[model samples]
Target: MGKNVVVLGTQWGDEGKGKVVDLLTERAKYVVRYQGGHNAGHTLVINGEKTVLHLIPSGILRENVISIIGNGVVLAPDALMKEMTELEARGVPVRERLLLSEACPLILPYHVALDNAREKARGRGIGPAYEDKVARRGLRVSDLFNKETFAIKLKEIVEYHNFQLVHYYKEAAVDYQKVLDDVLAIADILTAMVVDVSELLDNARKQGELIMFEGAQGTLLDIDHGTYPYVTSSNTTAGGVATGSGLGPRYVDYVLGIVKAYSTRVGAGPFPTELNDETGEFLRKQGNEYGATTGRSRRTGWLDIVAVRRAVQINSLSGFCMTKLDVLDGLKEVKLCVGYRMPDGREVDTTPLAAEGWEGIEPIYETMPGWSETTFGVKEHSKLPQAALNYIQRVEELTGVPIDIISTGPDRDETMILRDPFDA
Candidate 1:
């Protein structure tokens, strides 16, 4: 049997998972995205050229790797086409290397309208698309192939969303004909890539082709297990790999949780170790903390092991890859949140029940000495500064998971693989 490896973020989103997945694709024949939409940003740097991916997997850049958009993902046609056009112009063979699952849900013009309307009124994005999915009123990629059913379903859903947009949100209603025409125009291109992804994966398994399941967002952003309503619309953990990709959970050989040397989050949520001082700004500037998709400045803070440990437990993480360790360099001291003191004065080491539950919790920290030596672009593990190595050791000790990989820089070559996931 082929080894199926799962890679996800342990902390909040933007833990440098894209770069890690891209690097590990060297050993895998297939890379599949399980969940999330264009909202999840994966910024990859190869040969000093940076490429930001939203809807596609990081494996697309690799010539030999076949990238699959699994059923669990929300398919945004416009966004996918735009991304493909840009990549194709840059000489990437996207159409030949990429494949899409027929069961993938389609994100239509109405979804974007609802997304913008909801976010404007309540400061959230893309929640309505998944809402439609769960409500059983959403359209899937397979629906587009049947022209008669596609038009009928599109009209019904469009009218339903238009009611809410026009009456509830007081937003402009979407034009039905324009939306229909635009979608049908692009249908041919998208339909050409559709396939029975589950069957293909099963065949790949029989052939002993290693599969890498790439997760968007992070563990803490999971809909069922994460910070709740503040989280994304789908599962962003190990279990998602099975449901999203149509792969058996038992077939998954290893789960590599990607984490940052320091924590950073985008959008709204309760953060326990948030640094409001110049130190936070310094980390933001040093790490270049910005959302690859939204381009928003990420909120920076000290590393929170209380959350990371919970992620390790939730995902059954085999090991972790710590990225941006060099960002912590040059500081005299660094802080790590070991636990939290609740509003009722009870000390806890795990994440709270919901996002609101974290509102009043106080962080309990452990400070360590920082190193002045630059660790960026350092390929040798032994050559790393003692202080940097100590910080990594402490992370492993606190989380109870070995640090198997260390990303020294954004480039693929700037990594030190302590242990390969496929080999493990």
Candidate 2:
């Protein structure tokens, strides 16, 4: 296939890759979802209507382009069907070109129940499912389809999980058989959609079609390579595109990193430049800084140049797409983080080489003037407010990647495609 472009979140999750992918959908023949499960959500605003997508590629919003949920994804069959049903009810044509990888693991109801119970057992700070995945006790999509094999494993896991929940967390035990039956009831529906997506991807490549790999989480939440203990269950970096999409590194070409003019992160994690003052609140209000999935208010802050650069380097990003620039329209001044001061009294310029010393790092800030006037709905890069340009340039200098697309507003029409993505 043509060069595959993977668009991913740079900071913590919610870097606005959905909207970026939506804009780039015109150039992509297929959009491939690489990793993560239903825990993440991508919100897209089209013609003033809001569509929130979880577990499906955002490219499904457009016609003709194929959307595939690849093997690396953990499939929550119920959630998938629910989302598809909702879209169909809304008159969105989604069934024509959508596909699912048979190798993808299923996240049954028991998993969610266990996730919540285990999280409660360990208190709010601990991520038990992440721990389980690491311990090799986690469920996979293929597990649900295996009648005999999955049943044996399920009984063992359910017993093990219930012991922890009931004894340690003081929660009631789950009905293991009931859980299995509920999941099994829909097994045929889920199984019918499964196929060898690996071969499909390879065939698409041979046909010279363009594939866009979609990453769910952000770079900083990568399990193996990110700030550990605080990271998510799977890899979210661009390097994951190869393994996540079941393709070789040679087949992958361009990486598009998405960034917000300001910054926002969900859940509990160490944020050196997090703002708690009036300015932070203003940005949150202006930007509608709320999680599309959980509806939780996000932690807003100034753009961290150091973090952006670290993300770019780790992901080997080729270019960037800046989102939510219009949110900064009325501000008189803005700040960007340049570096960090670790607890060791040393200058740290990138994502900590190890998560061990990350908590000790203090953000170093740089200030810039906010441009006059609003940038809402502007499609031309030259017409963008000087402040937005300054912000974009500062990010480019730090990340060593050109800023090619600027999202002035939430609507797809508000995007400024600064560079032709296919042009080398």
Candidate 3:
């Protein structure tokens, strides 16, 4: 392979990455999912049909394309099998071409149970799973393969986890054996597909295959870099390719960051430009802003150029895939958040601020006129309305990256290709 093209979300999770990846799947040989877990879902609409992918890479719909769930991700085996079964039921063949990283961490039934339980117990804040992951106490997928090892590890972890449940909240102790059995049962199936993904990818690269690295969550939700305490437990930026997928940074030819026409974020966080009134609901309804994984209503807002610039800088993105332009079809005016004023009365431009006096800040927005006509089903880029074209250009200008692909609709054919593929 010459080099792999990485497609990632720049903002909070749920930025329509599935549709964008599916659109480019035809030219790709392997779609490598780098990080995150079943918590992130990538929904793709093809030929008016919707396929939501949670664990597997989004390129599974394309024939002959290999989909690798990389080591950095945490695997929820039941969820993975459920998604695979659903895809197979829909006449999509996936198993033969899919690969699992042996190094991935396994998510046991207890993990989900605990995740929900802890969230409920929090009563005021997010759950404890994140805390566990950060504290280096969470289970890994490889642990499932060794029942003896897994049991030992579980025993070690449960000493603390169970004590907290029973002593702190007065809940019953976690069923350690039940959790181990559940993880091991799925581990049998996962092991069949598991392989050294790093070697596979390296060999594929030598053979000149075209690979695409897919990322979950977003830059804003990155644990180390994103908004602290609110971010996910992994790096979701472009630089994560090397560590997440076992790929060299030099092998990346393009970092195609997927961005929505308007901004939307799922889960909890500080959203400076978040709309909470009638306009927010209007944007949500227009954009179908709902989480594919949790079905939670997404916090909808206008495009945040400040965040976009930050994303571009962190990911070093060379190109953009703007999705859901048609969502703003009927709006007379659209706003883009240009900058932010922190709670400390400090002004910031592109740098991401997770904590500090950055709370309770208001966004500075740049409003632009929206087009009257629906731009959906537009195949040619030149046929886009002047307003849509202008919006794309402005985003490119702000991010200092080219908007090469514009998704006018959900179907793979409904995209406007501004730049031809590298092979083309």
Candidate 4:
């Protein structure tokens, strides 16, 4: 039987999961993007050539590896077409290897209008589309096959959303004809790629093929488990793999949790260990800590084990893959946050449930001596400095999760794999 692996960020989103996925694609036959939409940013650099994927999986960059967008994703034809065209321009055989789940909810223009009107939704129809999906009114890829019913449902939805757009939000209503005509234009292109993703995954496993489940966002950004109001509108965790991809949890052999050497987050959230000083600025510039989708500058801070430990518990993570070790190369010292000292003078090792619990807490750190050697592009475990090794060891001791992989740089070949999940 073939083994399956699931990869995700354990911290806030963008912990370099994409680069790891691209590297690990060499071992798997199929790579599945289980959730999220174009709001996700998975950047992969191979031979120093950069490819930024918003909807497609990292495996698309490798020939013969089928990349799947599963049912849990909210489909936006506009974003999908644009991204596909760009990848094709780069000479990627996207049409040959990419597949889409027929059950994905469509993100139409009205959803975008509602998102913009509310001054929310990542300004990308993410939240509104999901709302319609749960409400059982949203269209799906399967609906594109039946033009007659699609038209009827499309008109009904357009009229319903336009009422709120014109009267409630004071925004211009979306045109029913425009939306219908627009979908009709590309309906064939989409239907060709649509398939029974759940059925296919089950068959693939029985046939002894390895399937890699790729998670978008991090555990702390999950809709149900994350800090509410600041979280993404999807499950972004391990259990999400089954719900989003149609793969049973029992078949998932390993869950690899990706984390950076330090912590960084974009937009609004209570960061318990945020550093707003020169050291923080240095980390920001050194790590290039910026949002891939929004290009917003990320807030930098020390590694918070309190947060990652909660993720370890939530996801049942088998191992850790520490990324961006090169970013801490020149620092005088690096700190790993073991616990938090609360205002009433008590030490707490666990993470708080809500945003309010994260506030008024001071991080207690166990400072390790920083190494002077540059870890950039270092592929060998022994090549790293003793101090760097010491810090990595301490993190494993605190978290009780072994660090199985170390990503030294941005490119695919710059990783040190202590244990490959497929082989495990």
* Alpha-carbon lDDT, every model: 0.88, 0.79, 0.78, 0.89
**What lDDT tens digits, residue by residue, belong to model 2 across residues 1-424?**
2467888998887777788888788787889898888755788888888888887789988888989888777777778888878898987766666788766666655567667765655612124444455577866666757788878887887899788777876778879899788778777666666668778877887888878888987898888777777788788998888777787778768888888888887778778789899998998899888644564689999888888887888888888888888888878888888989888888767767663656767888888888777888688777777777777888787767999888888888889888756544
| lDDT of model 2, residue 374 | 81
TM-scores, in order shown? 0.96, 0.91, 0.90, 0.97
Task: Report clash pairs, candidate 2.
Answer: 1-205, 105-140, 105-141, 106-140, 106-141
Off by over 4 Å in 4: 120-123, 292-295
* Top lDDT model: 4
TM-score, structure 2 vs. true: 0.91
TM-score quality measure for candidate 1 = 0.96
The runs of at least 3 residues in candidate 2 whose Cα sits more than 4 Å from the true structure, single-residue gaps closed, are 122-140, 143-153, 292-295, 343-345, 422-424
Candidate 3 Cα outliers beyond 4 Å, as residue runs: 123-139, 144-152, 292-295, 341-348, 351-356, 420-424
lDDT of 4 at 37: 87
lDDT of 3 by residue, 118-163 (tens): 6678611113443455677866666667778778988788777777
Considering lDDT, which of the candidate structures 1 and 4 is the better prediction for this target? 4
> Residue 254 lDDT in model 1?
91
Give the higher-TM-score candidate: 1 or 2: 1
Query: Which window of 10 residues has the lowest lDDT sum in candidate 3?
Result: 123-132
Question: What would the per-residue lDDT of candidate 1 be over residues 1-424, giving only the tens digit for each residue?
Answer: 4358899998888898889999999878999998888766788999999999988998999878999999988888889999999999998989999999988888877888888887789513356667888898888888888978999998998999899999999999999899889898899999999988888888888887989999988888888898877788888899899889888777888999999999987888878888889999999998998544564789999999999999999999999999998888899999999989999999988888864388888999999998888798689999999999999999989878999999888998899999888873
Worst 10 residues of 2 by lDDT: 123-132
lDDT of 4 by residue, 39-103 (tens): 66888999999988888888999887999999999999988988898999889978999999998
